[PDB]
């Protein structure tokens, strides 16, 4: 096993296949209902096995999250097409979570620990209130996440409630914050009912025009600015991000942040991102090898690169074919301009 | 594209006749020192699960010549005595003349990430502006940096060899630039010791240093006042208890309230950094999501908020400081008073 006190599956059957007749009944039982929308299982032997692993994973997650009332069911895409269409499920292999009237999609690494950490954040309220100095400091240190902060009069303000409702659309991928403190608003240059949008790795936020905002206005603004120029590949978002390719390719950059050379290369990448942040056709994918250790060998074999050093290249999402910038020495890293010139030819 | 075990048998039991012949085969040799397998499902099974993990790691690290063997504590007690294996359940790694112990979460991804860092050279060279910046932003790791003339200096080589003792748990850095040394206030052959979450380093006395001087100084300062529980170090850290108890503080750093509480904890740690009876264990729930349910049930606490308490390592029993509101966090002084009462047995389990 993994160690002392790591949980083991108790054989109990908490995750079963869901039919439409029992939906409204199953839905009442839990705080959150997670539905694994899958394609009908082959008889084939090797897919049946690959599916069983996923259920085993869901079973373990259901066990450890039982006390927090999160239910897990499976939905056959073919046999239960009617239920799926009514709930709006159309992507197979995705885990849909029903939280109130809202629907959140999980499309990342199908592991027990990844799912649990993800769901634990999803349970809570999407908006964090920033009041103290250390809380302001906490907000300021968020770098690789899309974050929004608004200044409102109080929690009873209708303008805050609209901001809160908009936050529910993107939970927990995009972080929403709110303050009712004039001191904090002054420091963050926020006017009453004004909301600032922070793109990852950018120095200055964008004030959303024409305040105050309705729920729809905020959702629309975020959706139009939802793809950062430099975005990080996270295990809980990996397939969602990878399927969000631009013209069939990804500009992939490997950088181990804990490694001084990786940190070095990432900082140069940030500058490249800032210089071309207004390019809608450009989105650089930052992958920290430490977040995907079991894919390191695969990446080094497929991309023919050494992941002990920072790398950047262009990956074709159809056949996993790529060309990589020649960086044999991480003490002779390319400048922002040299990266840009190499990138410029890619576009 | 995540790998699955292909069924091949790469992890076998190692005997002493074949130790020499196996050691020559790999760049790194990992030996799982285990208790004797019994004639019970009591459990040959538990063991096999651990072997399955080792098999998957052996598969994905095959191209890098990383070997994995198993050492029976009974049948190979003499080899074990020769190699200095004495802890049951620990994974020992032979890197050249050195022996490194792994004593953390026995998972494939955890092991691979750990071993990948262990393969590389222990000392990172800090030269550029961004590299200096990279070193400075290291907060929760014990780190050392020294200023030397060059890589050919015997004083650097002593520093490098000393780094091999603690790889990859303690980070060693070196610079040969007077510009970096002036920024970091380093004199020639001087080495600064940075305790986690402290504002100021400690200049190791009596420079220059031999390998022995550095190793022994680190050993004397190897348990930080505020230390983080890491998956790859969790059991090593947990077994390093003081009087049967750990002062455990849960703080989700990504959460502003958890970040808030952690900063207060740093203040308490800095103010009481010279207390040898004090070592606070910081646990970020995001690093152990599969232990959240266990913790909430056993400790009777809400891990959606920052918590701090004293946990008894024998029966996992604990009492927790009352922080019902994370917008009314205790001050640094209130934390000290509560901690002092724990250390003085005024608050026990
Ligand atoms: Ca089942
Ligand atoms: Ca859709
Ligand atoms: Ca994992
Ligand atoms: Ca997270
Ligand atoms: Ca949380
Ligand atoms: Ca809060
Ligand atoms: Ca709502
Ligand atoms: Ca403004
Ligand atoms: Ca800024
Ligand atoms: Ca408006
Ligand atoms: Ca998908
Ligand atoms: Ca998707
Ligand atoms: Ca696509
Ligand atoms: Ca490096
Ligand atoms: Ca942009
Ligand atoms: Ca990691
Ligand atoms: Ca690493
Ligand atoms: Ca470098
Ligand atoms: Ca060059
Ligand atoms: Ca075997
Ligand atoms: Ca020992
Ligand atoms: Ca141990
Ligand atoms: Ca590394
Ligand atoms: Ca380096
Ligand atoms: Ca050596
Ligand atoms: Ca000094
Ligand atoms: Ca000396
Ligand atoms: Ca140990
Ligand atoms: Ca919170
Ligand atoms: Ca004091
Ligand atoms: Ca100390
Ligand atoms: Ca995590
Ligand atoms: Ca979290
Ligand atoms: Ca707070
Ligand atoms: Ca108080
Ligand atoms: Ca005091
Ligand atoms: Ca007791």
UniProtKB/Swiss-Prot annotation, chain A:
Per the record, the coiled-coil ranges are none
Pfam families cross-referenced by the UniProt entry: Calsequestrin (PF01216)
Task: Write out the annotated subcellular location.
Answer: Sarcoplasmic reticulum lumen
Which sequence positions carry the modification called Phosphotyrosine? 263
Tell me which GO cellular component terms the UniProt record holds.
calcium channel complex; cytoplasm; junctional sarcoplasmic reticulum membrane; sarcoplasmic reticulum; sarcoplasmic reticulum lumen; sarcoplasmic reticulum membrane; Z disc
Glycans attached where?
Answer: 316
What assembly does the database describe for this protein? Monomer, homodimer and homooligomer. Mostly monomeric in the absence of calcium. Forms higher oligomers in a calcium-dependent manner. Dimers associate to form tetramers, that then form linear homomer chains. Interacts with ASPH and TRDN.
Q: Which family does it belong to?
A: Belongs to the calsequestrin family.
Physiological role: Calsequestrin is a high-capacity, moderate affinity, calcium-binding protein and thus acts as an internal calcium store in muscle. Calcium ions are bound by clusters of acidic residues at the protein surface, especially at the interface between subunits. Can bind around 60 Ca(2+) ions. Regulates the release of lumenal Ca(2+) via the calcium release channel RYR2; this plays an important role in triggering muscle contraction. Plays a role in excitation-contraction coupling in the heart and in regulating the rate of heart beats.
Could you tell me what this protein is called?
A: Calsequestrin-2
The source organism is Homo sapiens (Human)
